[PDB]
Design a protein around this nucleic acid. Sequence first.
RNA 1: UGUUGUAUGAAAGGAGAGAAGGUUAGCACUCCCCUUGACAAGGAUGGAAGAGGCCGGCCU
RNA 2: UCGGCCUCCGAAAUAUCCUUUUCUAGCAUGUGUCAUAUCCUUAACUCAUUGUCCCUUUUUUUU
Lengths: 119, 111, 56, 49, 195, 101, 26, 75
Amino acid sequence: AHKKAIRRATVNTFGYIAKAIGPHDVLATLLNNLKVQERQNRVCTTVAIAIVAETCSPFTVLPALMNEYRVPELNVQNGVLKSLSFLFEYIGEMGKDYIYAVTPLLEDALMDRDLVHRQ
Amino acid sequence: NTQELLDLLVKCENKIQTRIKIGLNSKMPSRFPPVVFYTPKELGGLGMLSMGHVLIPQSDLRWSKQTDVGITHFRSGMSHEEDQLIPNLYRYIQPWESEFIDSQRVWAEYA
Amino acid sequence: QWENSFVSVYSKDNPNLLFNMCGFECRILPKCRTSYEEFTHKDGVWNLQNEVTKER
Amino acid sequence: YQPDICKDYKETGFCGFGDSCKFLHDRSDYKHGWQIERELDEGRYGVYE
Amino acid sequence: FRRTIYLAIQSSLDFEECAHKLLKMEFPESQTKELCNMILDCCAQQRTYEKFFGLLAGRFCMLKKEYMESFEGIFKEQYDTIHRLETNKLRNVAKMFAHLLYTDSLPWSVLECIKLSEETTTSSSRIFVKIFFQELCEYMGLPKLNARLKDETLQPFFEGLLPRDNPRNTRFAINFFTSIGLGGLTDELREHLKN
Amino acid sequence: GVWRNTEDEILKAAVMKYGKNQWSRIASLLHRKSAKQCKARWYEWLDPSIKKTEWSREEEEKLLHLAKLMPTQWRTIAPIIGRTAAQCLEHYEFLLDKAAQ
Amino acid sequence: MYNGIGLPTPRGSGTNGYVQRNLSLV
Amino acid sequence: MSFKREGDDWSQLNVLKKRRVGDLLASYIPEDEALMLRDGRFACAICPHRPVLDTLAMLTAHRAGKKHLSSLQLF
RNA sequence: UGUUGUAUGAAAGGAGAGAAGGUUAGCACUCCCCUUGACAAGGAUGGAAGAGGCCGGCCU
RNA sequence: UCGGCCUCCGAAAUAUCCUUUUCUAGCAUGUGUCAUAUCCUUAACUCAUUGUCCCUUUUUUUU
Ligand SMILES: [K+]
Ligand SMILES: [K+]
Ligand SMILES: [Mg+2]
Ligand SMILES: [Mg+2]
Ligand SMILES: [Mg+2]
Ligand SMILES: [Mg+2]
Ligand SMILES: [Zn+2]
Ligand SMILES: [Zn+2]
C-alpha cells in the first residue's frame, strides 16, 4: 500500500496474530517474504519480525532469524540485520540478555565486503 | 416487400427466446409469458425489440410464383395472448422515400 | 467474371430493368410498359418522377 | 438438502471461478436442517451447555 | 377503444394487415366515426407523412360507404379547427387529405368547405390550404389539376374557393394561389377581374 | 521498450535452449517484453547469421542495382543481398550521400 | 396445405401456422 | 482456491523468474569460470582482478565484453 | 466345539487435483476399476506406467 | 367458407487418495580517467494543495 498508516496497522496485526497461532508459523511466513525485490515490502516485513519478536519474547524468534543469515542472498542478509536493528530499539533494557548472542553475528557483518552490510 | 425475410425474422425471434428459456432449464410457455421478454430494461425486463409478432402475408403458391397477385391470406407469426398486440419495430422508423422528400424540403427552407 | 456479374437488357421484349445496387434488389418498370397503366401503391415501391415534365 | 455452496469460497474465501462460479459465495457455517434433526433425535442438541 | 385502435396500428407492419385486424374485431357501425377519427390522429403524430395512413384510410373508403362518408365529415371538422394544431400535425393532416383526394377515395365535393377571404381564413387555415394544394399539384400536375378544378359538374362547390362575387375577394384569391406557386389556376379568375 | 545489455544476453541464451518457435516461453524470462518483441529483436539484430561486417564491393554493387530495379522494396531485396533490410536501407542512404559529394 | 396456401409443416417455423383469409379484399 | 487457482503472487513470481533466468544462464558458464560469493554475487575467475557482479545476467554480459575476452585468451 | 471370508460410505487425523514461466481445454494407445439399459456418455483429460544395452544398480 | 407448432430428466463443477474407528453390504470352510546508457542497492523517504499575493486608474456611494 502507498499510504503508510495501512502499513503500520498491518505490521501490528502480525504481532496480534502471533499471540494466537504462535510465533513460528508467523515467523516462517515473514522470513520467506524477505526474498522480494522491492524495498517497501522488505522493510515492512523487517519491522513485523521485530514486532512479533518483542511481543513474543526474543528467545522464540531469535534462532530462526539468526539461522536465516546464512541464506546466500543479499537482501535476506540485509533484512535480518535490519530487523535486529529494530528489535534492539524495541526491547530496550531487556536487550542485555541477548547481546552476547548476537555479538558474533554483528562482527561477521562488520567485516563484510558489502558497505550496506556495514551500515 | 421481401417475404423470405419475414419468415426468417419470425424464426430468429423464436430462437433468441428459446435460448433464454434453455438457459433457465425450462421451456414451458407459461413460466415465460412475453412480459418477461418485451418489458423494457428500465423495469427489469430483457427489453427485446420485436419484429416477429406480425401477420405474414400470403397468396396461392402456383400463381404467386408466376406473377404478382394480391395478398389473400395471412399466416400467424409468433404466438401471443390474443388480446395483446406487441408493437412493431418497423413502424417507429421513417421510410427512405419519406426521408428523402423531407430532407430536400427542410434544406431548401433553411437556405 | 461472367459468373459473378449480371447483365440486364431493356428492350421491346423485356419490359423490366433489373439491377443490384448496394444491398438492394431493384426492378424498374416504366409506365408505358405496364399493363393497364396501373401503379401498385404500397411500401417498397418508389415512384420515380420525370424531372422535366413533372410526371411519375 | 443440497446446499449449493461454493466449497472453496466457504472454507477458504477464495474461488478460482470468480463471477462464473455457479454456486453460492457465502461464508456462513450454520448447521443444515437434517443435522439439527439428527441432534434432536439423538438428544445431543444443547447438551453441552 | 382508442387505445386498441392505436395498438392495432402499431403492431401491424403493412397497411393490408392493419385493415384486416381492424375489420376482424367487428365494431358496430356506431363506432365508425370515431375509428376514422383515430386513424387520422395517429397519422398526425408521426414526424413525416407516411403513405401507410393514406392507404389505410383509402382502403376503408373503398370497403364500405360508411367510412367514406365519415372521412368526408372529418375533413370539414378538421378544417374548422385547424388553428388548434401544431405545425407538424397540420402538415400531416394536409398531406393525408391530399392523398385521399388524389386517389379519388374521397369526393371533391368536400372541397366546398374551404372559403378564401381576408376575413374568412385564419393564418393556420391559410397554411393548411397551401400545403394541401401544393401537394395535390405534386401528385397530379398543373394541367391535370386545372382540368379537374374547373369542371361543369363541380361548378357549385368551388365558388367559395374561387370567389367570383366580390372583386376584393377575387383579387385576394388570385394573389393567394399566385404566392403558393400555383399561378396557372388563377387565369380564368384574372379575366373575370378584367371584365 | 529498448533493449538493455542483459536482456540481449538472456534472449540469446534462451533461443539457444528453446529454439525459434516458443517465443511465449522466452517472453516469460524477460521483463516487460512481449513475444513479438522478442522475435523481432532476434531476427533484426541478435541472430548469428546477421553479418555485421563491412560491405564488400560486390555486395554494394548488387545493392545499387537492385534498388534501381525494385524501388523501396527492401524486404524483397534484402535476402538477395544477404543483409537485414534495415542494414540494406541505411547503407543505401550512405552511398547516396557519398555520391552527392 | 389446403388450397395451395400455408406451410407444408409448421415445424421449425416458430409459430402454430394458423391461416385466415384476408378480410380487407375489395 | 484449491479446485481452480485464483490470483497470482507477483512478488513470488518475480522471485521464480530470477531463479529461472539464473538456471538458464548458468548452464552455459563452466564451473571454473565463475565463483559464487557468500551473499549470492558472482565473480569472474578468468580475469586476474576478479570483478564481482551482482547477477548472472551481469556476469554473462561481462563475459561478452572485450576486457574479458582479452583476459580470456591469456588463460 | 471362536477366530484374517472380505468390501462400500461416513466421521476424525493426514496427503493435495496432467501441460519443460502461470492458468487451463480435451481425445486416445495397455490394464485397473466406478456410475450406466448401453455398440452412448461421464468418473481430475477416470487413475496408473511408457528411449536403448548389460548384471534395484551401471553406461550413451 | 373452415386451417391453431411446443410444456422434461441426469451427466460434462466444488476432486482424489491414505490411516484408525463407526454403519451397513457380500461371502466361505472343517472324518586510474574523461564522457555516456544500464543493472543492483540505500533512507519505516513521500502521494498534491486552499496558507490577507490585493499590491494596480487624477478615481473618491450622492443632500
Ligand atoms: K482411457
Ligand atoms: K482437464
Ligand atoms: Mg472419458
Ligand atoms: Mg475441467
Ligand atoms: Mg470434464
Ligand atoms: Mg467430453
Ligand atoms: Zn466459487
Ligand atoms: Zn571476466
